[PDB]
């Protein structure tokens, strides 16, 4: 509605992160980000995470606060708050992606 | 080179397969074909595989007779020999095709 | 209690380009929602594999167009088989298609 | 001991198309190749994010030309990292485009 920001990262994943590491990130992002009206994209391809996330301002910084210190990735590199007209990820909590390629790499570890 | 032949069939998972299952299924084959000399490309989705699977004829017919007995899928459905001209999957032992989503299906199972 | 699948290999047509990927599945998706048809589209280096799933006389309808269209060849041994329940509710026709594949077929 | 990575968000071009996405990757491939890059490029829903490593020299030489490139706008607080290591050897441009984006951008 009316209030609407986006905040986007790049971090570094932790060197030990696994397949299920992932999937528990994602669940726990599917379940959450639907209470709290959070929507975008979630990126992971050889030890690199970016994401998009979107909604009001409050929602947006409580999320980003934990996604912070999330032992799961290290060196979180943020781009400032930015007001958005629209969401560009609407009904999409959390959307993955992820490659073949990099599912087996994170399976096989 | 001179006789080559391809095989494509389309078989039901086991209902119990895990995302472990499927990364267990697709080490094996990289590391069979790659010896054979076979070629192709698997997909997954939804309970459902779709494999081609491309070499020599003996080669081909040696690894369909274990792929048809292995107790991860059901319900085999084959497609005869059919003789080919040059591999379609040059270099990739077997390439998987597996979305974000049946991925997340199979990992919280 | 009424559902059938058909699956089927087919070898896309040479000069196959992503334009007509693209339509095959814009097309898919507006027939199938209205025939209530659902299931799976796996396109990969000119190979098509194709899951489709309904009421048998809807399957068998779209599968005498989709049998004689040109962008593929080789439509072969289509397996028929009775199924307890849909294997992809939701999806009117799902694409599945690599980004090198995009890559190939966009080369024109 | 001589790697460095620079990482953006930008804006997609509202007029963006699949071709538009197809030629940046072509491009990419080539140039990357031959300055000695590599990385990644996710596009979604008017989104990229680039993640591009290699010699400070040649990194800082396609981010003048990728900053200025018409099909994106917003190109975002580029973050500037020295690397121990390439992550995406092998890769002179990765691009991760799911189906349903490829048949967005294909709507024209
Ligand atoms: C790369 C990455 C992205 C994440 N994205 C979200 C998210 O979008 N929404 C969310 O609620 N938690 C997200 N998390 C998880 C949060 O950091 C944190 O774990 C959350 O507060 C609760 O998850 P937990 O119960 O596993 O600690 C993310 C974590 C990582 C490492
Ligand atoms: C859907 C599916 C596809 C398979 N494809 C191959 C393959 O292409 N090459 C191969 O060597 N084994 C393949 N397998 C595994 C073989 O059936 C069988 O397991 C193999 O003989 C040895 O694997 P194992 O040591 O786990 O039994 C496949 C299995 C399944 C269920
Ligand atoms: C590999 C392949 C798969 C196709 N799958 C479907 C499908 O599931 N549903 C459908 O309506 N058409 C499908 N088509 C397209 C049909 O052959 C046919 O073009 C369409 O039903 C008629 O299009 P039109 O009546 O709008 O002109 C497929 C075509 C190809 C080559
Ligand atoms: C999102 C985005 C990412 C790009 N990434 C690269 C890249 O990694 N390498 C590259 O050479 N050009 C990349 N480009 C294209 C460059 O901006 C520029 O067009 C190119 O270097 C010059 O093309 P030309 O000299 O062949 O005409 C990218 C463009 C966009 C919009």
Same mark, same amino acid.
């Given at each position: 509605?009316?209030?609407?920001?986006?905040?986007?990262?790049? *971090? &570094?994943?932790?060197?030990?992160?696994?397949?299920?590491?992932?999937?528990? @990130?994602?669940?726990?992002?599917?379940?959450?980000? !639907?209470? !709290?009206?959070?929507?975008?994209? &979630?990126?992971? *391809?050889?030890?690199?995470?970016?994401?998009?996330?979107?909604?009001?301002? !409050?929602?947006?910084?409580?999320?980003?606060?934990? @996604?912070?210190?999330?032992?799961?990735?290290?060196?979180?590199?943020?781009?400032?708050?930015?007001? @958005? !007209?629209?969401?560009?990820?609407?009904?999409?909590?959390?959307?993955?992606?992820?490659?073949?390629?990099?599912?087996?790499?994170?399976?096989?570890?």
């Amino acid at each position: 509605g009316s209030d609407l920001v986006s905040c986007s990262y790049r *971090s &570094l994943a932790a060197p030990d992160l696994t397949l299920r590491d992932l999937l528990d @990130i994602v669940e726990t992002s599917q379940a959450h980000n !639907a209470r !709290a009206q959070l929507t975008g994209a &979630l990126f992971y *391809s050889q030890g690199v995470f970016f994401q998009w996330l979107e909604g009001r301002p !409050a929602a947006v910084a409580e999320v980003m606060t934990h @996604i912070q210190r999330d032992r799961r990735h290290s060196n979180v590199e943020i781009l400032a708050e930015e007001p @958005i !007209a629209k969401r560009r990820f609407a009904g999409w909590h959390m959307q993955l992606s992820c490659s073949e390629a990099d599912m087996r790499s994170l399976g096989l570890a």
